[PDB]
Structure formats: structure tokens, C-alpha cells
Design a protein around this ligand. Structure first.
Ligand SMILES: [Ca+2]
Ligand SMILES: [Ca+2]
Ligand SMILES: [Ca+2]
Ligand SMILES: [Ca+2]
Ligand SMILES: [Ca+2]
Length: 316
């Protein structure tokens, strides 16, 4: 809606207070006109038809329990936009300030989130296994980073190729979580996952096998569940990353970390330059070898560490 940019206040999923850019035209809208061609947030009203209705509000205060997941979807699409602009000098997922649309209250008891080739989607979960999934900034940015990915390298959603893609969302997932900086970790989804069990998560970058996910190529899933185990074999790539950023001996291979900012650099470059639709694990390394090699010279510690991490994950 054409209207007046203002700033509202509301309560997030974890019940934390934060401001959010709204749009005033009769109603206040969840429409942020300050980041590219707009961040709009929608109400799917528990249905499964999208996007739903551009959320509207009569006071610009969002402290209702129902507004919780919107607030946080709007707010964290923002931060993620900023992340990619500020850190990677990139304008929205398409690189040309496309609108980031998001819908909340998707279906009833929907314990998942997604990017549908055109918008993120979040369900309120079931209040056992999940709470409103947008509650988690890694949930949010992972998904938005599916868009980035579906406009850049276009990594197919299946087998080894799908696993990089999901891994890509898990790596920048953590890199926006660390951007935003509040109790940031290398786990996936700890803030919206199992309310009433404390300290677990969907996946572990530090230690994939913690939750049964693979941490070495050898130990990789060859079946067809989960579309070739895209969510399963992403750990191999994830521990490489964790390893590349943080260092550590893994299966007897030692790794000198190089930090996060160089993590993202090396991985963004690679996404945006060298990875194609069908890039398996062996060509990611090639991508990350060559990306660092560019961004840091062919004998840097950087180039070595990436070799370290992949060697560590068994990826030849
Ligand atoms: Ca209100
Ligand atoms: Ca946390
Ligand atoms: Ca996390
Ligand atoms: Ca939990
Ligand atoms: Ca699993």
C-alpha cells in the first residue's frame, strides 16, 4: 500500500520488545519502505493460501500474542536485508532490491518454514516441537538465503546439490544470527525449537552427529528420504564451515580457523561465482579454494584452512 513510513513497536516470539517500520494508510501495515522495494509481512490466517493479507493494524502497537510471529518475521527480514547489503554489498535476494514478502500463521500446527520460489512461509508450529518458527533469526535468514541461492548458483533441491543449498542457508543462517548478535551459536533453531526442553536444536554446525546428522563424507546418507537427505548431509558441509571459521581437530585433521567474516566472504563469493545448479561437494571445495585464492592469494592461511576443513570432512 502506498502510504506513510512510520515506526511501530511490538513483542517478538520470545516476548522481547523491538521496533518495526510500518506503513500508515488508514491502517498501519507491516510494510517496511526503508529497505529496497519493500519488506511486506502477511497474515495467512491459519489457511494454506498465500501470501494471505498484507498484515494491517489499527494502532501500530503489536503486543498481541497473535502478532508475535509477524513482528518477528518483519523485523528479521529487515536485519537479514541489512546483513546482505552491509556485509556483502548486495540488494535483497535478487541483488536488485526485490520485495521480501513473508506470510505468517501458515496453516494450523505447521512445524516448518519455507521459501516457495517467491516468498518465505512460517507456521506457528504446534507448541511442543516448535513455537512460531520466525521466532528464530537463523530460521528466518536460512530461508531468505534460499532465495539468494535460487537467484545466484541455483543449486538444485536434491542429493549432494540440495545439501550444499541447505548448508548454504545454515551457514548464512548463523552469519545473520551472529550479525544481529544476541546469544549467537552454531546451532540451528534453538530459539523456536522444543519449548520446555532447553539447550537442544534442529541441527548442530559445531557437531552435526550430535543430532544424528553426518560429519564426514564417509558417513553420508545415500538414500532418498528428505530428497536425497538434503537436511541430513548438509552437516558435512556445515562442519567444514564451522571448522573453517572456528578451527579444531576433526577425525585427526587439524584446522586453523580464520573467523566468520572471512567465512562468509569465501562462501558468498563461491555461491555468487563458481557454484552451478549441479555442484556436488567436490566442486564446492573447488569453489571455496578458488574464492579464498582470489580474496586472499594462492598461499594464504585462508586457502590452506579451507583445504584443511574439506580434508577434515573427507571431501576430495
Ligand atoms: Ca494493534
Ligand atoms: Ca541462542
Ligand atoms: Ca542458532
Ligand atoms: Ca528446546
Ligand atoms: Ca534429522
Amino acid at each position: 500500500i502506498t502510504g506513510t513510513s512510520t515506526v511501530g513497536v511490538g513483542r517478538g516470539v520470545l516476548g522481547d520488545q523491538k521496533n518495526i517500520n510500518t506503513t500508515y494508510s488508514t491502517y498501519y501495515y507491516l510494510q517496511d519502505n526503508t529497505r529496497g522495494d519493500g519488506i511486506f509481512t502477511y497474515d495467512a490466517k491459519y489457511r494454506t493460501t498465500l501470501p494471505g493479507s498484507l498484515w494491517a493494524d489499527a494502532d501500530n502497537q503489536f503486543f498481541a500474542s497473535y502478532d508475535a510471529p509477524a513482528v518477528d518475521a518483519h523485523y528479521y527480514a529487515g536485519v537479514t536485508y541489512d546483513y546482505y547489503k552491509n556485509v556483502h554489498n548486495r540488494l535483497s535476494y535478487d541483488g536488485n532490491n526485490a520485495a521480501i514478502r513473508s506470510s505468517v500463521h501458515y496453516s494450523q500446527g505447521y512445524n516448518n518454514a519455507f521459501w516457495n520460489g517467491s516468498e518465505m512461509v512460517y507456521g506457528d508450529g504446534d507448541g511442543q516441537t516448535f513455537i512460531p518458527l520466525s521466532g528464530g533469526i537463523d530460521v528466518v535468514a536460512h530461508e531468505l538465503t534460499h532465495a539468494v541461492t535460487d537467484y545466484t548458483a541455483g543449486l538444485i533441491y536434491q542429493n549432494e546439490s540440495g545439501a550444499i543449498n541447505e548448508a548454504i542457508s545454515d551457514i548464512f543462517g548463523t552469519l545473520v544470527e551472529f550479525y544481529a548478535n544476541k546469544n549467537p551459536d552454531w546451532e540451528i533453531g534453538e530459539d523456536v525449537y522444543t519449548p520446555g526442553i532447553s539447550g537442544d536444536s534442529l541441527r548442530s554446525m559445531s557437531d552435526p552427529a550430535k543430532y544424528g546428522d553426518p560429519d564426514h563424507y564417509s558417513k553420508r546418507y545415500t538414500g532418498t528420504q528428505d530428497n536425497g537427505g538434503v537436511h541430513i548431509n548438509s552437516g558435512i558441509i556445515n562442519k567444514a564451515a564451522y571448522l573453517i571459521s572456528q578451527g579444531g581437530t576433526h577425525y585427526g585433521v587439524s584446522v586453523v580457523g580464520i573467523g566468520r567474516d572471512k567465512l562468509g566472504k569465501i562462501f558468498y563469493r563461491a555461491l555468487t561465482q563458481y557454484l552451478t545448479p549441479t555442484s556436488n561437494f567436490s566442486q564446492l571445495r573447488a569453489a571455496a579454494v578458488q574464492s579464498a585464492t582470489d580474496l586472499y592469494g594462492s598461499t594464504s592461511q585462508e586457502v590452506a584452512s579451507v583445504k584443511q576443513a574439506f580434508d577434515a570432512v573427507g571431501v576430495k
